[PDB]
Amino acid sequence: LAPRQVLDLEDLVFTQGSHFMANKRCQLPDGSFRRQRKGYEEVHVPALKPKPFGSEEQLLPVEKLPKYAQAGFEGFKTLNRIQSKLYRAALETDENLLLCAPTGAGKTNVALMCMLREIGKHINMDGTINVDDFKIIYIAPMRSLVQEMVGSFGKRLATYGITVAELTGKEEISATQIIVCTPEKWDIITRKGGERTYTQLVRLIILDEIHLLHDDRGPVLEALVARAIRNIEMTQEDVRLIGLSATLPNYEDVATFLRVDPAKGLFYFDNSFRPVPLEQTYVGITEKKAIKRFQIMNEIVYEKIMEHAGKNQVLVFVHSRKETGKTARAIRDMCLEKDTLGLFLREGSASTEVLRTEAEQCKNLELKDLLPYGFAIHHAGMTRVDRTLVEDLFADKHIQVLVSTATLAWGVNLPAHTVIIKGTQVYSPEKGRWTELGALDILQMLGRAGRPQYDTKGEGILITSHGELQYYLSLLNQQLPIESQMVSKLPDMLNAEIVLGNVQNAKDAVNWLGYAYLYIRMLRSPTLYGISHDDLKGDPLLDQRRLDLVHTAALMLDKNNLVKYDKKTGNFQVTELGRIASHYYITNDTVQTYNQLLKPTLSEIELFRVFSLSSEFKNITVREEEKLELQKLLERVPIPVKESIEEPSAKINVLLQAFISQLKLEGFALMADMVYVTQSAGRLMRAIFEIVLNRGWAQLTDKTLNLCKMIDKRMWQSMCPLRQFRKLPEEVVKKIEKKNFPFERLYDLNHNEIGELIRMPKMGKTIHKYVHLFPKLELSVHLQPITRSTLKVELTITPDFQWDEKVHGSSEAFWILVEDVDSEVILHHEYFLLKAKYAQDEHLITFFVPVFEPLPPQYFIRVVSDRWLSCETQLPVSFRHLILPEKYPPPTELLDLQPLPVSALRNSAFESLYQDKFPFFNPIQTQVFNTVYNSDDNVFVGAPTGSGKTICAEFAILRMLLQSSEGRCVYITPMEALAEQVYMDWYEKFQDRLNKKVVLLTGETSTDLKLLGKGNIIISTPEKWDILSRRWKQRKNVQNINLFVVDEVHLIGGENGPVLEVICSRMRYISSQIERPIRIVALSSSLSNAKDVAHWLGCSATSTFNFHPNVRPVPLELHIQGFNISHTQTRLLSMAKPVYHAITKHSPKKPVIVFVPSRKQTRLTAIDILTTCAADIQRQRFLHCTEKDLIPYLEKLSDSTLKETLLNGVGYLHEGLSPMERRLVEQLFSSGAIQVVVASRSLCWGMNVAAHLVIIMDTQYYNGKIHAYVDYPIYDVLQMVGHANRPLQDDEGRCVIMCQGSKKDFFKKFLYEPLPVESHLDHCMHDHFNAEIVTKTIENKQDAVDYLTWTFLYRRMTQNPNYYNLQGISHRHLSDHLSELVEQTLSDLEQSKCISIEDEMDVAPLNLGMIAAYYYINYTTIELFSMSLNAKTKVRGLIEIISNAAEYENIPIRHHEDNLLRQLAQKVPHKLNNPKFNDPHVKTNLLLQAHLSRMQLSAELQSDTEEILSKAIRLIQACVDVLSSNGWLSPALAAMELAQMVTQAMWSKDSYLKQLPHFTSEHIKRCTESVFDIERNALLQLTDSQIADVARFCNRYPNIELSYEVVDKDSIRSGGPVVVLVQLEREEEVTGPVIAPLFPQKREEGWWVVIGDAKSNSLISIKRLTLQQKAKVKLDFVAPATGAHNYTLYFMSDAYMGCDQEYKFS
Ligand SMILES: O=C1Nc2cc(=O)n(Cc3ccccc3)cc2CN1c1cccc(OCc2ccccc2)c1
Secondary structure (H helix, E strand, O other): OOOOOOOOHHHHOOOOHHHOOOOOOOOOOOOOOEEEOOOEEEEEEOOOOOOOOOOOOOOOEOOOOOHHHOOOOOOOOEOOHHHHHHHHHHHHOOOOEEEEOOOOOOOHHHHHHHHHHHHHHHOOOOOOOOOOOOEEEEEOOOHHHHHHHHHHHHHHHHHHOOOEEEOOOOOOHHHOOEEEEOHHHHHHHHOOOOHHHHHOOEEEEEEEOHHHHHOOOHHHHHHHHHHHHHHHHHHOOOOEEEEEEOOOOOHHHHHHHOOOOOOOOEEEOOHHHOOOOEEEEEEEEOOOOOOHHHHHHHHHHHHHHOOOOOOOOEEEEOOOHHHHHHHHHHHHHOOOOOOOOOOOOOOOOOOOOHHHHHHHHHOOOOHHHHOOOOEEEEOOOOOOHHHHHHHHHHHOOOOOEEEEOHHHHHHOOOOEOEEEEEOOEEEEOOOOEEEEOOHHHHHHHHOOEOOOOOOOOEEEEEEEEOOOOHHHHHHHOOOOOOOOOHHHHHHHHHHHHHHHOOOOEHHHHHHHHOOOHHHHHHHHOOOOOOOOHHHHHHOOOOHHHHHHHHHHHHHHHHHOOOEEEOOOOOEEEEOHHHHHHHHOOOOHHHHHHHHHHOOOOOOHHHHHHHHHOOHHHOOOOOOOOOHHHHHHHHHHOOOOOOOOOOOHHHHHHHHHHHHHOOOOOOOHHHHHHHHHHHHHHHHHHHHHHHHHHHHOEHHHHHHHHHHHHHHHHOOOOOOOHHHHOOOOOHHHHHHHHHOOOOOHHHHHOOHHHHHHHOOOHHHHHHHHHHHHHOOOEEEEEEEEEEEOOEEEEEEEEEEOOOOOHHHHOOEEEEEEEEEOOOOOEEEEEEEEEEEOOOOOOOEEEEEEEEOOOOOOOEEEEEEEEOOOOOOEEEEEEEOOOOOOOOOOOOOOOOOOOOOOEHHHOOOHHHHOOOOOOOOEOOHHHHHHHHHHHHOOOOEEEEOOOOOOOHHHHHHHHHHHHHHOOOOOEEEEOOOHHHHHHHHHHHHHHHHHHOOOOEEEOOOOHHHHHHHHHHOOEEEEOHHHHHHHHOOOOOOHHHHOOOEEEEOOHHHHHOOOHHHHHHHHHHHHHHHHHHOOOOEEEEEEOOEOOOHHHHHHHOOOOOOEEEOOHHHOOOOEEEEEEEEOOOOHHHHHHHOHHHHHHHHHHHOOOOOEEEEEOOHHHHHHHHHHHHHHHHOOOOOOOOEOOOHHHHHHHHOOOOOHHHHHHHHOOEEEEOOOOOHHHHHHHHHHHHHOOEOEEEEEHHHOOOOOOOOOEEEEOOOEEEEOOOOEEEEOOHHHHHHHHHOOOOOOOOOOEEEEEEEEHHHHHHHHHHOOOOEOOOOOHHHOHHHHHHHHHHOOOOOEHHHHHHHHHHOHHHHHHHHOHHHOOOOOOOHHHHHHHHHHHHHHHHHHHHHOOOEEEEOOOEEEEOHHHHHHHHHOOOHHHHHHHHHHOOOOOOHHHHHHHHOOOHHHHHOOOOOOOHHHHHHHHHOOOOOOOOOOOOOHHHHHHHHHHHHHOOOOOOHHHHHHHHHHHHHHHHHHHHHHHHHHHOOOOOOOOHHHHHHHHHHOOOOOOOOHHHHOOOOOOOHHHHHOOOOOOOOOOOOOOOOHHHHHHHHHHHOOOOOEEEEEEEOOOOOOOOOOEEEEEEEEEEOOOOOOOOOOOOOOOOOOOOEEEEEEEOOOOEEEEEEEEOOOOEEEEEEEEEOOOOOOOOEEEEEEEOOOOOOOEEEEEO
């Protein structure tokens, strides 16, 4: 709150812009002499004599400059004078430079030296250069110069393998190192907020012709540099700035502006450094006289040209493309007439080069007229090849007199000897007037006088008007001061910075102005900028003036609603109009106009008028002279121009229409105006489109999008779409149009019929081709009801057309529009990008759409091309048969009970777990307390995450221990992480203090059964408890449990939810058989339908407590921030600053958790938060302890970056970190030492920590399998929001959710409101049905139908039938659908040979079904095994086969991982045949080969390898079973060897010594071979700790002896049973489990005793066991005849290599 004054900006602004002079006088050098010709005044400024070298100045040969930089300098012997003074500064220092030189001084090679300096850092090994490690930006003021420089730098840097490209005219430019472009282009790019995607890699910025600061375009430069500098401060990344300027006053302020050290990087060269000394002639015209003004100019021109009439070149600059033809024509038109003036400057009156200029005449246009006589023309466009030919022919210095336009001076380098500029008057469309030419143009033009290698002295002449034009004299003689035009453009600039989020308020804006050139200029010339010496003395830093300017601009932006700004706080709030305004580069008055006139019902007439009213056009007016032509155009343009007579408005309208109709024009001012309106047209219309699209106005969205496309394609909607193909003849198309036939119908005609219909058969084939090149999409929909208000839509987009790289490029963009029945409203919309490589792949787009209870017949889904005209597909979505679900019952009302005390629990040993922490239970806990603690009946508690639902389950547990001391309780959590957290908490709370037994179920079965036996409290995930309790008939400990607790039961609606549902239903089923109730306690998030889950689990209406999300003990303040960006990387980057703003606004001093999509995003967001904080001049602001205190803990960290961020008070959490590291970060965060932690989404279940503020960065994650982004499960988000809960510390929790705009409303709905859930079990049926058939719970079809009655599914099917695709809620429909389900499931199971179906009723388990059910493996997996396995299968084939298991289907493919898997593919022993690298099976294969080969990989691949190796064993054992069941010897035992070598990480053929720890590839050389051989270990390297590991290895590794007998050798014979008895004994007590350090989940040894014939390759008998101490093994098999043959007895492990044994017998 500081005093603010409203300024009048029009008072402070410089009106003349570039034409403005701070100059009082102008001092003329040496000979000033004036010659008065009475028709004009002539002022001569002579050339400066060439300066002799100074004492230290010398030329610097290319050999002297650095080795790596010599390339690109071929063609240049040594450096230029200027460049020689600059070479050390450019190449050998990183200092910011400002180079002031005469125009044409060759400042270019200096910039190239700066570039080469940047390149020199990247030298690398023998990679030659690093293309992707850096980017360089070259900003040039003119487009022509941009292309010239792209060419030059391209040629010069070609040897370094570097791409130079032009950005000004859409992504893909990401592959380009040097981006050349205009200030406004780069400003537009860096405004986007995803700017960082471009600028993160930028190490260098070169501002060319920076004196443009004085020009009206200058503020753009100021904004650019300000933005970049603040970015140097904010990112801490150093970015070098090189300014290049003409020699003019104030340049030192430019150096300051650019952060240049005046004693280091500032270089100024006066006019004596001009490469060709210039004799200057300044002509000016006395009076305004009529039309003889022009004849005066031409008379001047003639007299001054003729002084050169032998070898000399003259270049004349004129202001119109017509004036080129008129002036070159005019001297030949004038002159000659008098004694053939200057005739034959064609050298020899014969044919020297005359034959060459007369031979090129066979060119076109007016070129042919002037060319035989040394003459030519250069003007803007309309020539082609001819412009080039004028250039090359003028270049060999034959064309003598060349008349041109400034575009030549800017576009290509061809200096002449003499340069004449005519009149200095140019038409300005934006001013709508005729004004005096821009300073930059004059400089670059006159800069062409004299030829560097061909001229000792140059000459130039500037003809102009007399008055107040001493200005030019000021300009060329280095006296014209550079000022700041910033005051003019201040509101649009300020708005841009507000939209980027760089200024959040007035103070930030003042500080922002501090970086502007305006600031310095105001400081050093205060009177000029309208500041009193008094004001300046009292306020040297100009706080008052900056604050006042900011105040005025803010009021302007606030008026037009680009920004909400309150004068009290001074804070800025971005609006959408401002956001679009900054993005689409529109002035604030125009956005306000649009805001006024835009409405859904706006007609097209009205639209064109609104476009005409854009303030970009405010100075355009209708001249008398153009009226007639306008009239003609209006008669020819299609859209009615409403009641506007010839106003500026109507003129603009018709000019745009005329541009679309491609009508040719004559009037030149009119042509200029049209170009001006059409350049802006696309942007303005795209802006309008964005406005109405995001307001959801369907008609106007349609109109506006079409208008964008029409301006782009220069055609009306009415015409034929084929026009959009540019290589097609236009009269063919007009013939097609003349036929009043639909374009669509052309799809169904063969090319014969095509050529036939058009009576032009010759084109018939080609047309056909293009017809099928036209983008076309097929649309398929799948509709699932969610709530009465909400529907789920799966939209399948199928491309139908041929892709062409020429036509479609790399991609094609579409808008998915979901509109209501009237097509007046867009209910949902999103951007869909079809990539070329991924075309022909099917695209599944999922979203939700709102509906309203008086349901319409249908909605409409239109997919419309973003570019192509008349490209669309519309699909009706029919509601006729739609059955909305039942509305949700009210939540259980939360009563305010007295906050029941801990003493209400009556036990002391119980109360001691609580009283220390809290005096009382919360309202939810007290309300449910009586029910849960006192009764035994089943109970459901719904409540938001963080309501403390946990200790209700704990009430129940305490009661179970109260009733029976030996009682057994099983607790299930969907997530393993949660399971371990609960395990820690309750191990302390029960096993330690209350001294009960607390166990945690693991992967392995046997040890788990044991844990089930001893445990009082048993913690498990659904899968473990599933593979356990499947055998429940046979396992008593499963049958008897007093208490069953399920937490987060709403996860039944998520992935893996079917298993939760199955085990819960099985527990209910079990409960009814023993008529001893198994109590069931279910905890959940607020459910829209509690009632269904309650009926399912046996909860009474009173024992069911389901609470609304607003009763959450810590009240939630939820804020949802939409971002409209369709490209995720860009969105994240645009989210970076809003995150920091969220921290500092909502939780400045209190803890903050920030969830981000991926591992890498954790580090990046942490670093952004860090550096931004520090750039607020507040560092450690997030560190609430002293750095000194942290050092002792941080000494234990391996990770460097984690140390640095923790040191700044910000930690982060991802899976790559060690448990120690994670625990460290969590402990520090909980303690309050660090205020901020940034965790990946995968850890949201695995974090025990809480915050005051939770920020969710984006909502989506990348799926590499489908090549698309997918939404966070609503469950993960619920969890994340729950992590901001702090009942003790905070009076409120706070959450800020950041997301793509299309998702925004979704989170406003299902966060605030309770969550509807459904059962996906019906798609998971097969494994469970197979399982229950094996255990004989299901013996027939009726048993399956009955089994289904225990599921949540059964309940939901009548509540939301259409979700499960039931067409009715009648009991008939239910029975029918269920029967259909069991029939299909059982059928699929029979076809897979898992089960056998008998008598159409009964079912029985088969072998494969038993195998799958036993090892807990998907049935398709073992089916696949049975199909792909044969007698000749070996190890490699086995790996390929096991890699294809369905268990590995969910192995993730991450972003940009295809390259890494491609690299891994060549590094592995078994090359894979035609692999797809987004295929998870290919990945698991490669990773298996990697694990075997001891390849260490990236962290991600390592975690993946872990998840694979997890399920590897059961898969392999399944292969063993299957192989033996088919009677194959060789493939078996190979499977076993594979099990071994998977456990111990070794290959087929390999050292057995590789199993011992602390062995490398170097050691084996001296080992020349068995753990059995281990005479002094002194053979090689030993450490006593390493000695401990090896000695520990050998006392475990099996030492086993085996006896065998064929019982009664002789009494067995012909046909009868044979029993081979084997006896196993080991000479050591087994200690510890298997040790396989490289195996993630340590397994226990098991052994196969196999009997088989090695000749016929038959496995006659097999058995698997665990040894214990010693073991008896009975192998029984049937005998062949003539009883005596040769057999083999194998003894194999699943773990170790080398323990394998063979015994031959008979
Ligand atoms: O962002 C999203 N994430 C999700 C996560 C998730 O788990 N599910 C499954 C699920 C959801 C709730 C309960 C249980 C299971 C679904 C989504 C869908 N979703 C989304 C995406 C695009 C658009 C959209 O508009 C919705 C909308 C718009 C306007 C008015 C009303 C609604 C929504």
